Each structure stands twice: as C-alpha cells, then as structure tokens.
Amino acid sequence: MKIQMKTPLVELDGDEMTRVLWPLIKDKLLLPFIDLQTEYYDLGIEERDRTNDQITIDAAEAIKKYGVGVKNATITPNQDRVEEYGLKEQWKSPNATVRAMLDGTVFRKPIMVKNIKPSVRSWQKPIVVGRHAYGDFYKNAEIFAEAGGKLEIVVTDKNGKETRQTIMEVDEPAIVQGIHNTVASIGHFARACFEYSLDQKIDCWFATKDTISKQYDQRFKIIFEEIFAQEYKEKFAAAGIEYFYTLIDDVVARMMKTEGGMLWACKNYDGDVMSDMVASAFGSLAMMSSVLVSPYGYFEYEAAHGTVQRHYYQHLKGERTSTNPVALIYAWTGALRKRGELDGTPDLCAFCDSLEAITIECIESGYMTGDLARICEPAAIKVLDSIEFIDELGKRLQQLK
Amino acid sequence: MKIQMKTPLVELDGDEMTRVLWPLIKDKLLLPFIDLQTEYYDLGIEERDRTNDQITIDAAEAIKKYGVGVKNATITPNQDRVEEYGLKEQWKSPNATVRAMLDGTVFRKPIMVKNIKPSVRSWQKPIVVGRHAYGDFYKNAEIFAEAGGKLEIVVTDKNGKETRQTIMEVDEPAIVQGIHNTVASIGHFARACFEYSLDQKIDCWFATKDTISKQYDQRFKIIFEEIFAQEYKEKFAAAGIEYFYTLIDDVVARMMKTEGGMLWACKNYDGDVMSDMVASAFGSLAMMSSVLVSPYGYFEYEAAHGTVQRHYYQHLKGERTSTNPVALIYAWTGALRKRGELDGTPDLCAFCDSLEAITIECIESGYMTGDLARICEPAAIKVLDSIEFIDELGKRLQQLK
Ligand SMILES: NC(=O)c1ccc[n+]([C@@H]2O[C@H](COP(=O)([O-])OP(=O)(O)OC[C@H]3O[C@@H](n4cnc5c(N)ncnc54)[C@H](OP(=O)(O)O)[C@@H]3O)[C@@H](O)[C@H]2O)c1
Ligand SMILES: NC(=O)c1ccc[n+]([C@@H]2O[C@H](COP(=O)([O-])OP(=O)(O)OC[C@H]3O[C@@H](n4cnc5c(N)ncnc54)[C@H](OP(=O)(O)O)[C@@H]3O)[C@@H](O)[C@H]2O)c1
Numbered sequence: 020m021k022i023q024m025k026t027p028l029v030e031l032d033g034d035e036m037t038r039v040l041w042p043l044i045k046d047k048l049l050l051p052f053i054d055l056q057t058e059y060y061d062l063g064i065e066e067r068d069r070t071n072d073q074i075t076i077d078a079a080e081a082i083k084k085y086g087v088g089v090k091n092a093t094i095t096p097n098q099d100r101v102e103e104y105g106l107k108e109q110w111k112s113p114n115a116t117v118r119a120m121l122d123g124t125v126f127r128k129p130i131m132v133k134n135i136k137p138s139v140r141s142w143q144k145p146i147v148v149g150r151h152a153y154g155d156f157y158k159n160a161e162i163f164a165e166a167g168g169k170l171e172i173v174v175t176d177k178n179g180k181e182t183r184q185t186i187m188e189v190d191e192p193a194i195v196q197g198i199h200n201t202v203a204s205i206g207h208f209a210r211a212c213f214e215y216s217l218d219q220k221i222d223c224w225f226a227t228k229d230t231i232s233k234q235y236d237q238r239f240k241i242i243f244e245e246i247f248a249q250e251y252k253e254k255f256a257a258a259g260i261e262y263f264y265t266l267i268d269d270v271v272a273r274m275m276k277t278e279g280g281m282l283w284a285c286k287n288y289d290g291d292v293m294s295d296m297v298a299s300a301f302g303s304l305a306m307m308s309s310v311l312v313s314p315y316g317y318f319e320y321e322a323a324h325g326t327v328q329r330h331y332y333q334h335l336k337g338e339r340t341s342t343n344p345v346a347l348i349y350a351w352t353g354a355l356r357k358r359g360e361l362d363g364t365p366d367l368c369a370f371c372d373s374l375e376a377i378t379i380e381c382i383e384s385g386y387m388t389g390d391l392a393r394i395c396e397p398a399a400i401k402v403l404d405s406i407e408f409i410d411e412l413g414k415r416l417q418q419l420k
Numbered sequence: 421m422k423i424q425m426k427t428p429l430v431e432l433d434g435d436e437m438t439r440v441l442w443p444l445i446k447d448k449l450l451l452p453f454i455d456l457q458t459e460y461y462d463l464g465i466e467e468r469d470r471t472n473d474q475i476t477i478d479a480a481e482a483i484k485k486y487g488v489g490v491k492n493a494t495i496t497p498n499q500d501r502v503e504e505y506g507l508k509e510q511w512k513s514p515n516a517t518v519r520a521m522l523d524g525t526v527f528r529k530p531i532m533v534k535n536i537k538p539s540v541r542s543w544q545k546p547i548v549v550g551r552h553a554y555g556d557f558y559k560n561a562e563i564f565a566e567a568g569g570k571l572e573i574v575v576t577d578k579n580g581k582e583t584r585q586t587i588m589e590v591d592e593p594a595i596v597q598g599i600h601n602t603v604a605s606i607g608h609f610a611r612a613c614f615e616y617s618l619d620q621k622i623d624c625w626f627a628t629k630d631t632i633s634k635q636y637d638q639r640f641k642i643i644f645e646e647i648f649a650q651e652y653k654e655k656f657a658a659a660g661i662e663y664f665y666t667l668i669d670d671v672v673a674r675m676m677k678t679e680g681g682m683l684w685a686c687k688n689y690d691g692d693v694m695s696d697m698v699a700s701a702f703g704s705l706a707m708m709s710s711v712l713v714s715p716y717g718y719f720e721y722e723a724a725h726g727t728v729q730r731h732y733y734q735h736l737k738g739e740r741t742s743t744n745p746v747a748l749i750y751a752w753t754g755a756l757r758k759r760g761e762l763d764g765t766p767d768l769c770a771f772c773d774s775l776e777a778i779t780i781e782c783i784e785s786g787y788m789t790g791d792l793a794r795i796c797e798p799a800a801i802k803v804l805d806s807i808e809f810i811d812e813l814g815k816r817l818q819q820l821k
C-alpha cells in the first residue's frame with residue numbers, strides 16, 4: 020500500500036519549463052509511493068489572466084488555512100509577456116502576492132554535492148540567504164511623470180494628519196517610485212534570522228545602506244541591533260556565534276573572501292539578487308532550496324530559480340532539454356516532510372529523506388543534468404535529459420518506499 | 421625642473437584612513453616631480469559640518485568650472501557618525517551631491533597584477549562596472565510613519581495637475597521611501613555604456629527587475645533597448661560585440677560562471693554593490709579604478725572603496741597599518757593624465773604612465789600591502805605598511821621623472 024497523508028498540501032502550479040517538469044515529478048517520484056492529497060491551484064499565467072489574478076489570492080488564503088504550501092515557478096509579466104501571451108494587463112508577481120499575505124523570511128540554501136566545487140575559491144561551507152519576504156519594492160507604487168513636476172511622498176494618518184517629503188522637483192520627464200515596510204514585519208525578520216542562526220549554530224550577517232537611506236534602511240539596522248541586544252546577545256554568546264552588521268557594498272566584498280558557513284540576512288531585493296549569486300557560485304540555480312517561514316506559522320516551499328523560460332523555448336521547438344528538476348523535487352520533499360511532522364506521519368518524512376538522498380547519490384555517481392555536467396569533476400558518466408534524470412530517480416526509489 | 425601644469429586639478433579632500441594616506445601620496449609621489457596645481461576643497465567631515473555642507477557644493481561647482489576633479493573618500497554620516505563626531509545632522513553623501521551635480525556614469529575597473537588570482541574561478545578577463553551616477557535612492561525622500569496611514573507618491577506638474585499612486589495603507593508603524601530618475605539621465609547612461617563598450621571592444625550587459633518595477637525599472641530597460649536599436653545595433657555588429665539584457669538576479673547568477681571581459685551596466689545602487697563584489701573577487705577593494713564620466717564633459721577620479729574606517733581606528737591606537745593606497749594613486753594619475761590630455765602637456769601623461777607601471781611592478785616583484793599579501797601567489801617578499809609601500813614607489817620614481 021501507498022504512504023498516507025492526514026492533511027493535504029496546498030499545491031500552486033506554474034509556468035513554462037517548470038510547468039513541464041511538475042507532473043513528471045508527481046507522476047514518477049511521488050504518486051507511485053504516496054496517495055498524494057493536495058488542494059490544487061493553477062497559477063499558470065493563462066489561469067491568472069482568466070481569473071484577473073483572483074486564483075493567486077485564493078491559493079494564498081488556502082495556505083493560511085492548511086498551513087503548508089508548495090509552489091511551482093511562475094511568470095511575472097512585463098510588457099514583453101503581455102504581448103507574448105495576449106494578457107489583459109501586467110499582472111503583479113504571484114510570489115509578491117503570496118509572500119505579502121503570509122509574511123516572513125525566505126531561507127535559501129545551496130544543495131551541495133561532492134563532485135561540484137564552488138565558483139568562489141574560499142567557499143568551503145554553505146551560505147544561507149535569509150531573505151525578508153515582505154514589502155520594499157515588491158509592493159511599489161510608480162508614476163511616469165511625462166511632464167515632470169514636484170515629486171513627493173505623502174503619508175496621511177488615520178486622523179487626517181498629512182506628512183510630505185519632496186523627492187525632487189524636475190523640469191523634464193522623470194520616473195517615480197515609492198515603497199514601504201513595517202516595523203513589525205522587520206522585527207519578525209530579525210527574529211527569524213537570529214533563531215535560524217541559533218538553530219543552525221551559524222553566525223548571522225546583515226547589511227543595508229543606512230548611510231544613504233537614513234530613515235528607511237537605518238530602521239532595519241536599528242531594529243536588528245535593538246532586538247539582538249535585548250533578546251539574542253547572550254543566546255548567541257552561549258552558542259559560540261556572532262551577529263555582524265556592515266554596509267551592503269562592504270558585506271558582498273567580504274563575502275567573496277569568506278569560507279562561508281553563515282546566515283546572510285538580506286532585505287527583500289538583496290535577498291533575490293544574492294540568493295541567485297550564491298546558488299550559482301555553489302553549483303547552479305537548481306541546486307538550492309527555498310522555504311518561506313511565516314511568523315504566523317505558515318510554510319511555503321518553492322524553487323529559488325524561475326520558470327527557465329529559455330529552456331521552455333527549446334522544449335517548444337521539439338527539443339529535449341536537460342533542465343535540472345532538483346529544486347522542484349526539494350520543494351515537494353521539504354513540504355511533504357513538514358506536513359508529516361505537523362501531522363505525525365513519520366513514514367512521509369522518511370520517504371522525503373530517501374528521495375533527497377537518492378537525488379544526491381545519483382548526481383554524485385555521475386548521472387546528472389547538463390547544468391551540473393558543465394561544472395562537475397570528474398566529468399559526468401551520462402548527461403541525462405530532464406525526463407531521463409527523473410526516471411532514474413524513480414527507478415532507485417522502485418528499487419528501495 | 422619639475423613637470424608643469426596648465427590648468428589646476430580640482431582637489432576634494434576626505435576622511436579617516438584615506439585622509440591619512442592623501443598627503444603621503446602628494447608629498448612622496450607627486451610634488452617632487454610635478455609643480456602640482458590644484459584648487460583645494462576640504463570635504464573632511466568637520467569642514468562639511470562647519471560649512472553646513474556648503475563646501476561640498478562649492479567643490480562640485482569648481483569641477484564644472486575646470487573640468488576635472490580628484491576626490492578622496494569621505495564619511496557619509498548615519499546616527500553612529502553623528503554621535504561619534506558631534507555633528508549638527510546626518511549630512512547627505514558628498515558623493516551623492518557631487519555625482520548629482522555632474523551627472524554621468526562611473527566606470528569601475530579592477531587593477532590587475534600577475535601574482536593575484538581571482539576569487540571566482542572562471543574570471544580570466546576584467547569586468548568593468550558601468551554605474552549610473554544619477555538618482556534613484558541616492559536622492560531619496562523618507563518618512564517614518566509612526567502612526568501608519570495611507571502611504572502615497574504624488575506628482576504635481578508645473579500647471580498644477582496632480583497624479584497620485586498608493587504604495588500601501590497600513591494600520592501600524594511603517595517606513596516610506598520615494599526615489600526618482602530622469603529619462604534624459606537614463607539616456608546618457610545607456611549611451612555612455614554603449615560608447616565605452618565600442619571603445620573597449622567588449623560586450624555590454626545590463627539588468628534590472630522590470631517584472632517587479634513595471635514603470636520604473638522597465639523604463640531603464642526600454643530606454644536601453646530603444647537607444648541600442650536606433651543608434652548602436654550596427655556599430656556593435658561591426659565591432660564584433662553584443663548587448664545583453666536580463667533580470668538582475670539572473671545576471672549575477674550568469675556572472676559567477678562567465679570568463680569576464682564585459683562591461684556590466686548597473687543602476688546606481690546595483691553599481692555600488694557590484695563594483696565592491698567585482699573589486700573584491702579580482703583582488704581587493706583597493707585594486708580598482710573609478711572615474712565618473714559626465715555627459716556635460718566633466719571627469720571625476722576617485723577610489724571605489726571608502727575611508728577604510730576600521731584601519732583608521734587602528735591608526736588612532738598608534739599602530740602602523742598596511743592600508744593599500746593603490747586606488748588613491750590611480751585616482752591622481754587618472755586625473756592628472758586627463759588634465760594633461762586636455763591641456764596638451766604630454767610630460768604629465770608620461771609621468772602618470774610611469775607611476776602606474778611602477779606600482780604594478782613593485783607588487784608583482786613581491787613588495788606589497790597586507791590586503792594583497794593575504795591572497796598573492798607566490799607569497800610576498802615584504803609586507804609593507806602604508807608609508808613604506810609609498811616610500812618604495814617614490815624611490816623607484818627617484819631612480820627613473
Ligand atoms: N517563480 C519564481 O520563483 C521566479 C523566479 C525567477 C524568475 N521567475 C520568472 O521566470 C521567468 C524567467 O526568468 P529568468 O530566465 O531570468 O530566470 P530563471 O528561470 O531562474 O532561469 C535563468 C537561467 O538560469 C539557468 N537555470 C535556471 N533554472 C534552471 C534549472 N532548473 N535547470 C537548469 N538551468 C537552470 C538557465 O541558464 P541557461 O539559459 O544558461 O541554461 C536559465 O535560463 C520570468 O518570467 C520571471 O518572471 C520566477
Ligand atoms: N567616499 C567613498 O567612495 C565611500 C565609499 C565607501 C564607503 N565610504 C564611507 O567609508 C566609511 C567606511 O565604510 P566601509 O568600512 O563599509 O568601507 P571601506 O572604506 O571601503 O572599507 C571596507 C573594508 O574593505 C577593506 N578595504 C577597503 N579599502 C581598503 C584599502 N584601501 N586597503 C586595504 N583594505 C581596504 C578593509 O577590510 P578589512 O577591515 O577586512 O581590512 C575595509 O575595512 C563609511 O563612513 C562610509 O560612509 C565612502
């Protein structure tokens with residue numbers, strides 16, 4: 020008989036190459052071994068277009084309801100994408116919508132294998148990116164001021180008190196952006212980071228540009244140093260670990276020379292950019308896990324990479340591709356493990372451990388996708404296309420579940 | 421007799437460890453060989469505090485007047501710095517003020533030596549960062565909305581027409597930021613980049629997050645692709661080079677695996693962060709040149725690093741330090757060379773070439789500062805403190821100028 024689940028996983032489907040890979044993973048790696056229960060939400064671009072993005076909201080509310088979600092990579096449309104898919108509008112990122120509704124910190128960690136050396140010489144130990152999931156430019160307002168003018172931010176309190184600040188006054192076409200964050204969300208982000216550091220017994224590094232952004236970035240800096248002082252200094256001391264703060268340009272300079280082995284806390288944008296930098300340097304974009312940890316008790320598992328649009332275009336031309344499904348597999352296994360821990364179904368957790376170990380063993384034994392074959396030592400035995408890779412994982416699972 | 425100058429250089433002095441190094445460079449490397457003419461502006465934190473930052477404006481106007489400036493690294497004060505120096509207020513960055521008044525693109529290039537391998541394995545050729553010098557969060561408005569409220573951006577045109585967009589409405593303390601850029605400045609940035617690429621025969625890479633920032637970042641993207649199409653596509657084709665655009669997280673992922681050898685165009689913030697990443701990976705923060713190229717014909721030479729605050733603290737404790745003056749020397753030599761090219765005084769340009777070559781030769785022969793000694797192969801012969809390093813350069817110049 021198959022492994023049973025107590026509570027369904029909330030399943031958010033997606034786009035392009037990852038959409039292609041998603042059913043292969045379920046059909047070959049999960050369904051033969053688990054009577055998989057999920058609440059399914061299709062966040063493909065066409066279904067979001069059809070529902071005016073309502074399906075994205077519905078999926079986020081369902082994660083709140085059940086507690087644990089697993090998300091496939093999605094297209095965030097720009098004007099090229101509006102033309103390409105014939106869209107009603109440039110829909111907001113489904114990641115931005117979901118992350119805003121859950122709140123939290125996205126922990127991104129390289130998935131390491133013995134036959135790939137890091138791009139960065141000194142890196143000997145994993146660097147985890149702790150990415151603030153809330154606010155900043157992921158909920159922006161923007162105006163194209165085609166006739167220029169006085170450009171301002173304006174805050175009106177709930178009793179009508181107005182506070183204004185002028186960005187610039189211009190006599191020419193200009194572009195304008197406004198962003199926000201909240202004291203409470205920044206606070207939950209500091210704590211999530213400090214807790215993660217303690218649990219993993221790693222130092223925590225944080226950086227902003229507080230010299231330039233004196234009320235905004237400096238608030239992050241002050242909140243972290245206050246919360247650390249009042250709540251974590253002694254805990255950290257006791258655990259043999261340290262909190263380090265510096266300016267953002269300095270921190271990335273320092274990072275190129277470190278041995279790694281820390282938690283790098285990052286503001287939302289920085290976390291996006293640097294989780295890609297870190298994943299790439301350690302191996303590839305596919306060799307990274309990503310989990311949003313909400314201060315409200317929710318969890319969301321995902322790949323850190325996107326839809327692999329470029330590979331999807333090759334797929335559309337009838338070509339086999341060698342897109343690496345590792346991150347998508349680890350999103351499923353992370354989510355299923357968490358679900359089985361919360362539900363008290365340890366057989367589910369054990370299978371997740373197995374699938375993960377089998378994924379590593381297969382790559383380390385020399386059967387891998389093209390992203391890893393380019394960078395492994397010694398050279399790969401077989402360079403498997405996406406479906407061949409997944410079939411070999413299913414086979415090792417059938418031979419064990 | 422000493423080398424003569426026709427037009428003075430505008431000299432902007434600065435802070436902490438770089439302030440210490442500045443007169444050593446002039447006294448030992450320049451003054452014995454050049455009758456150095458400069459218009460001197462002290463942008464030390466105390467002099468800026470005294471003049472309410474007026475000296476910063478005066479120095480910027482003088483660069484406009486003469487055409488070429490050379491700038492020492494300066495403290496941008498946050499609250500720690502206000503406490504530390506007893507300041508009237510958290511003064512705005514002097515770099516932000518000067519750069520705003522000149523406009524342009526800051527070209528940042530590693531200074532390479534044969535005895536230091538890059539941190540990033542694949543990097544075989546220099547990566548140049550082309551950093552937009554104007555706008556974005558380097559001219560921000562910010563509000564700490566302690567009682568929450570409706571958070572907006574507002575544009576009022578010169579005929580009183582109001583355009584509003586809501587960032588968020590909140591029922592809790594929040595922070596608010598607004599930034600701008602101009603179509604014209606973005607345009608001069610694209611062109612400076614495309615011209616630099618053509619002159620240097622290197623590809624140009626650019627990236628933003630236009631999927632998230634749909635009116636702001638997407639304007640940069642559209643401006644670049646329009647200007648390239650209408651003005652550079654054929655020139656680039658003819659030169660054997662290519663323009664590449666992608667999302668910012670993807671570009672840094674791609675960068676960890678490239679052999680280098682391109683111009684990386686960067687929005688202002690990205691350019692700050694990544695020029696540090698690139699300098700560090702190639703060698704150290706000191707092994708990088710930086711020049712602002714204004715579309716109005718001005719030039720400003722500087723180090724890419726800051727004041728080396730941490731070393732200054734060691735200096736204050738009576739300790740010799742091994743701070744690397746290379747970037748400060750290259751700012752002088754870059755500026756003096758440009759001045760002699762504009763003035764028709766080739767003896768000045770020849771000396772700059774000499775000093776630069778002697779700097780490289782000394783390091784490559786094994787006499788270097790501690791930042792390079794940590795990372796060179798084979799190991800250094802002597803690890804020279806800052807003043808000893810500079811004395812050895814003067815000696816080689818005395819033995820040649
Ligand atoms: N939902 C998300 O988490 C998320 C995240 C990022 C992007 N996106 C969306 O994804 C779309 C494409 O974005 P993008 O091309 O910038 O980023 P991407 O999907 O992360 O892929 C960028 C490049 O990295 C390599 N790569 C990424 N994942 C890979 C994998 N699984 N296996 C092998 N190689 C992989 C490929 O490089 P090569 O081409 O050199 O092979 C790929 O073209 C956009 O519409 C964007 O909005 C969504
Ligand atoms: N004017 C500017 O261009 C500019 C630029 C950046 C920063 N700043 C200002 O500089 C102050 C300090 O900023 P920061 O410490 O973040 O950055 P920084 O001055 O660039 O120095 C950061 C670290 O990098 C290494 N480093 C930088 N320059 C070096 C050199 N010349 N020789 C040897 N090592 C060098 C040192 O690392 P180790 O400590 O490990 O030895 C140093 O502590 C702040 O007040 C900031 O506002 C100004």
Ligand SMILES: [Mg+2]
Nearest residue numbers: 291295323669
């Ligand atoms: Mg990303």
Ligand SMILES: [Mg+2]
Nearest residue numbers: 268692696724
């Ligand atoms: Mg910098």
